[PDB]
Protein backbone atom coordinates (compact mmCIF):
# COMPACT_ATOMS: atom_id res chain seq x y z
CA UNK A 1 0.00 0.00 0.00
CA UNK A 2 1.73 3.14 -1.25
CA UNK A 3 1.02 6.44 0.50
CA UNK A 4 1.65 10.14 0.01
CA UNK A 5 1.96 12.73 2.77
CA UNK A 6 0.21 16.04 2.03
CA UNK A 7 2.46 19.13 1.82
CA UNK A 8 1.40 22.82 1.96
CA UNK A 9 -0.23 23.88 -1.32
CA UNK A 10 -1.18 20.33 -2.36
CA UNK A 11 -4.73 19.57 -3.50
CA UNK A 12 -6.50 16.32 -4.37
CA UNK A 13 -6.29 17.41 -8.02
CA UNK A 14 -2.56 18.25 -8.02
CA UNK A 15 -1.78 14.97 -6.22
CA UNK A 16 -3.99 12.99 -8.63
CA UNK A 17 -2.27 14.50 -11.69
CA UNK A 18 1.20 13.83 -10.26
CA UNK A 19 0.46 10.16 -9.61
CA UNK A 20 -1.73 9.45 -12.64
CA UNK A 21 -5.00 8.82 -10.83
CA UNK A 22 -8.24 10.74 -10.27
CA UNK A 23 -9.77 12.99 -7.63
CA UNK A 24 -12.67 10.53 -7.22
CA UNK A 25 -10.36 7.55 -6.68
CA UNK A 26 -8.32 9.39 -4.03
CA UNK A 27 -11.54 10.35 -2.24
CA UNK A 28 -13.00 6.83 -2.46
CA UNK A 29 -9.84 5.16 -1.19
CA UNK A 30 -9.49 7.57 1.73
CA UNK A 31 -13.16 8.06 2.61
CA UNK A 32 -13.01 11.80 1.90
CA UNK A 33 -16.09 14.03 1.59
CA UNK A 34 -14.19 17.35 1.51
CA UNK A 35 -11.47 18.93 -0.64
CA UNK A 36 -9.96 20.33 2.59
CA UNK A 37 -6.57 18.75 3.35
CA UNK A 38 -3.94 19.43 6.05
CA UNK A 39 -0.15 19.19 5.78
CA UNK A 40 0.92 15.86 7.31
CA UNK A 41 -2.24 14.06 6.21
CA UNK A 42 -1.44 10.57 4.95
CA UNK A 43 -3.30 9.56 1.78
CA UNK A 44 -3.48 6.02 0.49
CA UNK A 45 -2.62 5.84 -3.22
CA UNK A 46 -4.20 3.46 -5.72
CA UNK A 47 -2.03 1.05 -7.70
CA UNK A 48 -0.73 2.40 -11.00
CA UNK A 49 -3.12 1.63 -13.85
CA UNK A 50 -1.54 -0.78 -16.31
CA UNK A 51 -3.42 -0.23 -19.59
CA UNK A 52 -5.72 2.27 -21.29
CA UNK A 53 -8.09 1.54 -24.16
CA UNK A 54 -7.95 4.60 -26.43
CA UNK A 55 -11.30 6.36 -26.87
CA UNK A 56 -12.52 9.01 -29.35
CA UNK A 57 -11.10 12.38 -28.34
CA UNK A 58 -8.00 10.98 -26.61
CA UNK A 59 -4.61 12.38 -27.54
CA UNK A 60 -1.11 11.45 -26.37
CA UNK A 61 -0.87 14.84 -24.59
CA UNK A 62 -4.16 14.28 -22.74
CA UNK A 63 -3.35 10.68 -21.78
CA UNK A 64 0.13 11.70 -20.59
CA UNK A 65 -1.54 14.21 -18.27
CA UNK A 66 -4.19 11.69 -17.16
CA UNK A 67 -1.63 9.04 -16.28
CA UNK A 68 1.05 11.29 -14.78
CA UNK A 69 3.62 10.62 -17.47
CA UNK A 70 4.94 11.96 -20.81
CA UNK A 71 4.26 11.58 -24.53
CA UNK A 72 7.80 10.26 -24.84
CA UNK A 73 7.26 7.47 -22.28
CA UNK A 74 3.94 6.43 -23.84
CA UNK A 75 5.54 6.26 -27.28
CA UNK A 76 8.55 4.26 -26.05
CA UNK A 77 6.48 1.75 -24.06
CA UNK A 78 4.13 1.05 -26.97
CA UNK A 79 6.57 1.17 -29.88
CA UNK A 80 4.67 4.02 -31.53
CA UNK A 81 6.08 5.27 -34.83
CA UNK A 82 4.36 8.68 -34.58
CA UNK A 83 2.61 10.80 -31.92
CA UNK A 84 -0.89 9.91 -33.21
CA UNK A 85 -3.14 7.20 -31.68
CA UNK A 86 -6.08 4.99 -32.66
CA UNK A 87 -9.50 4.32 -31.11
CA UNK A 88 -9.43 0.80 -29.61
CA UNK A 89 -5.64 0.74 -29.27
CA UNK A 90 -4.51 -0.75 -25.96
CA UNK A 91 -1.73 1.42 -24.54
CA UNK A 92 0.55 -0.01 -21.86
CA UNK A 93 1.19 2.52 -19.09
CA UNK A 94 4.38 3.18 -17.08
CA UNK A 95 5.19 1.68 -13.68
CA UNK A 96 5.74 4.08 -10.76
CA UNK A 97 9.49 4.34 -11.22
CA UNK A 98 9.37 5.04 -14.94
CA UNK A 99 6.46 7.46 -15.47
C1 LIG B 1 0.95 23.38 -18.76
C2 LIG B 1 -0.50 23.65 -19.13
O1 LIG B 1 -0.90 24.75 -19.48
N1 LIG B 1 -1.32 22.56 -19.04
C3 LIG B 1 -2.74 22.62 -19.34
C4 LIG B 1 -3.48 21.81 -18.27
O2 LIG B 1 -3.08 22.32 -17.00
C5 LIG B 1 -4.99 21.90 -18.51
O3 LIG B 1 -5.64 21.08 -17.54
C6 LIG B 1 -6.45 21.91 -16.69
O4 LIG B 1 -5.63 22.55 -15.70
C7 LIG B 1 -6.36 23.42 -14.82
C8 LIG B 1 -5.33 24.11 -13.94
O5 LIG B 1 -4.55 23.17 -13.20
C9 LIG B 1 -7.39 22.61 -14.03
O6 LIG B 1 -8.17 23.51 -13.25
C10 LIG B 1 -8.09 23.26 -11.83
O7 LIG B 1 -8.97 22.25 -11.42
C11 LIG B 1 -8.78 21.88 -10.05
C12 LIG B 1 -9.75 20.75 -9.78
O8 LIG B 1 -11.08 21.15 -10.05
C13 LIG B 1 -8.99 23.08 -9.11
O9 LIG B 1 -8.54 22.60 -7.85
C14 LIG B 1 -9.10 23.22 -6.70
O10 LIG B 1 -8.30 24.35 -6.37
C15 LIG B 1 -8.78 25.02 -5.20
C16 LIG B 1 -8.04 26.33 -5.13
O11 LIG B 1 -8.21 27.06 -6.34
C17 LIG B 1 -8.54 24.11 -4.01
O12 LIG B 1 -8.93 24.79 -2.82
C18 LIG B 1 -7.84 24.85 -1.87
O13 LIG B 1 -7.66 23.59 -1.25
C19 LIG B 1 -6.54 23.56 -0.36
C20 LIG B 1 -6.33 22.13 0.07
O14 LIG B 1 -7.40 21.65 0.88
C21 LIG B 1 -6.79 24.51 0.81
O15 LIG B 1 -5.57 24.53 1.55
C22 LIG B 1 -5.79 24.48 2.97
O16 LIG B 1 -6.25 25.74 3.42
C23 LIG B 1 -6.51 25.78 4.84
C24 LIG B 1 -7.11 27.13 5.14
O17 LIG B 1 -8.37 27.29 4.50
C25 LIG B 1 -5.20 25.53 5.59
O18 LIG B 1 -5.49 25.48 6.98
C26 LIG B 1 -4.58 24.21 5.15
O19 LIG B 1 -3.29 24.07 5.74
C27 LIG B 1 -4.45 24.16 3.62
N2 LIG B 1 -3.96 22.85 3.19
C28 LIG B 1 -2.92 22.68 2.37
C29 LIG B 1 -2.59 21.26 2.03
O20 LIG B 1 -2.27 23.63 1.93
C30 LIG B 1 -7.09 25.91 0.30
O21 LIG B 1 -7.56 26.75 1.36
C31 LIG B 1 -8.16 25.91 -0.80
N3 LIG B 1 -8.25 27.24 -1.39
C32 LIG B 1 -9.25 28.09 -1.17
C33 LIG B 1 -9.15 29.42 -1.86
O22 LIG B 1 -10.21 27.81 -0.46
C34 LIG B 1 -9.34 22.83 -4.20
O23 LIG B 1 -9.03 21.90 -3.16
C35 LIG B 1 -9.03 22.18 -5.56
N4 LIG B 1 -9.93 21.07 -5.83
C36 LIG B 1 -9.54 19.79 -5.91
C37 LIG B 1 -10.61 18.79 -6.23
O24 LIG B 1 -8.37 19.46 -5.73
C38 LIG B 1 -8.18 24.29 -9.57
O25 LIG B 1 -8.54 25.46 -8.85
C39 LIG B 1 -8.40 24.53 -11.07
N5 LIG B 1 -7.60 25.64 -11.55
C40 LIG B 1 -8.04 26.51 -12.47
C41 LIG B 1 -7.06 27.56 -12.89
O26 LIG B 1 -9.17 26.45 -12.93
C42 LIG B 1 -8.31 21.88 -14.99
O27 LIG B 1 -9.22 21.05 -14.28
C43 LIG B 1 -7.51 21.04 -15.99
N6 LIG B 1 -8.41 20.42 -16.96
C44 LIG B 1 -8.23 19.18 -17.45
C45 LIG B 1 -9.26 18.71 -18.43
O28 LIG B 1 -7.27 18.48 -17.13
C46 LIG B 1 -5.28 21.38 -19.93
C47 LIG B 1 -6.76 21.53 -20.32
O29 LIG B 1 -7.10 22.91 -20.55
O30 LIG B 1 -4.55 22.14 -20.90
C48 LIG B 1 -3.13 22.09 -20.74
O31 LIG B 1 -2.62 20.79 -20.89
C1 LIG C 1 -23.27 24.07 -20.85
C2 LIG C 1 -21.79 23.83 -20.94
O1 LIG C 1 -21.32 22.73 -21.18
N1 LIG C 1 -21.02 24.91 -20.75
C3 LIG C 1 -19.56 24.86 -20.80
C4 LIG C 1 -18.96 25.44 -19.52
O2 LIG C 1 -19.31 24.60 -18.43
C5 LIG C 1 -17.44 25.56 -19.62
O3 LIG C 1 -16.95 26.37 -18.56
C6 LIG C 1 -16.37 25.61 -17.48
O4 LIG C 1 -17.38 25.03 -16.65
C7 LIG C 1 -16.85 24.20 -15.60
C8 LIG C 1 -18.04 23.56 -14.90
O5 LIG C 1 -18.93 24.54 -14.37
C9 LIG C 1 -15.96 25.03 -14.67
O6 LIG C 1 -15.34 24.14 -13.74
C10 LIG C 1 -15.67 24.46 -12.38
O7 LIG C 1 -14.87 25.48 -11.87
C11 LIG C 1 -15.23 25.89 -10.55
C12 LIG C 1 -14.26 26.99 -10.17
O8 LIG C 1 -12.92 26.54 -10.17
C13 LIG C 1 -15.21 24.72 -9.56
O9 LIG C 1 -15.86 25.24 -8.40
C14 LIG C 1 -15.45 24.69 -7.15
O10 LIG C 1 -16.27 23.59 -6.90
C15 LIG C 1 -15.98 22.95 -5.66
C16 LIG C 1 -16.76 21.66 -5.66
O11 LIG C 1 -16.40 20.89 -6.80
C17 LIG C 1 -16.34 23.91 -4.52
O12 LIG C 1 -16.09 23.28 -3.27
C18 LIG C 1 -17.25 23.30 -2.43
O13 LIG C 1 -17.49 24.61 -1.91
C19 LIG C 1 -18.71 24.69 -1.17
C20 LIG C 1 -18.94 26.15 -0.84
O14 LIG C 1 -18.01 26.61 0.12
C21 LIG C 1 -18.60 23.81 0.08
O15 LIG C 1 -19.89 23.84 0.69
C22 LIG C 1 -19.81 24.11 2.10
O16 LIG C 1 -19.28 22.97 2.76
C23 LIG C 1 -19.19 23.13 4.18
C24 LIG C 1 -18.43 21.94 4.71
O17 LIG C 1 -17.05 22.04 4.38
C25 LIG C 1 -20.61 23.25 4.74
O18 LIG C 1 -20.53 23.43 6.15
C26 LIG C 1 -21.32 24.43 4.10
O19 LIG C 1 -22.69 24.43 4.49
C27 LIG C 1 -21.25 24.38 2.57
N2 LIG C 1 -21.74 25.62 2.00
C28 LIG C 1 -22.72 25.67 1.09
C29 LIG C 1 -23.09 27.05 0.61
O20 LIG C 1 -23.29 24.67 0.67
C30 LIG C 1 -18.26 22.37 -0.31
O21 LIG C 1 -17.95 21.60 0.85
C31 LIG C 1 -17.07 22.30 -1.27
N3 LIG C 1 -16.92 20.94 -1.77
C32 LIG C 1 -15.99 20.08 -1.35
C33 LIG C 1 -16.03 18.71 -1.97
O22 LIG C 1 -15.14 20.38 -0.51
C34 LIG C 1 -15.51 25.18 -4.67
O23 LIG C 1 -15.90 26.15 -3.70
C35 LIG C 1 -15.68 25.77 -6.08
N4 LIG C 1 -14.76 26.89 -6.28
C36 LIG C 1 -15.16 28.16 -6.41
C37 LIG C 1 -14.08 29.17 -6.65
O24 LIG C 1 -16.34 28.48 -6.34
C38 LIG C 1 -15.95 23.50 -10.11
O25 LIG C 1 -15.70 22.35 -9.30
C39 LIG C 1 -15.49 23.21 -11.53
N5 LIG C 1 -16.20 22.09 -12.12
C40 LIG C 1 -15.61 21.21 -12.94
C41 LIG C 1 -16.49 20.15 -13.51
O26 LIG C 1 -14.41 21.27 -13.20
C42 LIG C 1 -14.87 25.72 -15.48
O27 LIG C 1 -14.12 26.60 -14.65
C43 LIG C 1 -15.47 26.52 -16.63
N6 LIG C 1 -14.42 27.13 -17.44
C44 LIG C 1 -14.50 28.37 -17.94
C45 LIG C 1 -13.33 28.83 -18.75
O28 LIG C 1 -15.49 29.08 -17.76
C46 LIG C 1 -17.03 26.23 -20.93
C47 LIG C 1 -15.54 26.18 -21.17
O29 LIG C 1 -15.00 24.93 -20.77
O30 LIG C 1 -17.64 25.55 -22.05
C48 LIG C 1 -19.04 25.61 -22.02
O31 LIG C 1 -19.57 25.03 -23.17
Numbering used by the authors: 16 to 114
Quoted passage from the original study:
LysM domains, which are frequently present as repetitive entities in both bacterial and plant proteins, are known to interact with carbohydrates containing N-acetylglucosamine (GlcNAc) moieties, such as chitin and peptidoglycan. Glycosidases, such as muraminidases and glucosaminidases, hydrolyze glycosidic bonds between carbo­hydrate units, while peptidases, such as amidases, l,d-endopeptidases, d,l-endopeptidases, l,d-carboxypeptidases and d,d-carboxypeptidases, hydrolyze amide bonds of the peptide stem at specific positions. d,l-Endopeptidases belonging to the papain-like peptidase superfamily possess an NlpC/P60 domain which is responsible for their catalytic activity. This domain is commonly associated with PGN-binding domains such as the SH3b domain, choline-binding domain or lysin motif (LysM).
The structure was solved to 1.75 Å resolution. Monomers 1 and 2 are identical, while no electron density was observed for the LysM2 domain of monomer 3. Monomers 1 and 2 bind chitohexaose in the same manner, but differently from monomer 3. In summary, we observed that LysM1 of monomer 1A mainly contacts the last four GlcNAc residues (GlcNAc 6 to GlcNAc 3), while LysM2 of monomer 1B mainly contacts the first three GlcNAc residues (GlcNAc 3 to GlcNAc 1); this LysM2 domain could also potentially interact with a fourth GlcNAc residue if a longer chitin polymer was present. The recognition of GlcNAc 3, GlcNAc 2 and GlcNAc 1 is achieved by LysM1 and LysM2 of monomer 1A and LysM2 of the symmetry-related monomer 1B. There is a strong difference between this intermolecular dimerization mode and the intramolecular dimerization mode observed in the crystal structure of fungal Ecp6 bound to chitin. With our crystal structure, we now claim that both events occur, since each LysM domain in the asymmetric unit binds a chito­hexaose molecule which could also be bound by a LysM domain from a different monomer. Additionally, the structure of P60_2LysM bound to chitohexaose provides the first structural evidence for intermolecular dimerization of LysM-containing proteins on a GlcNAc polymer.
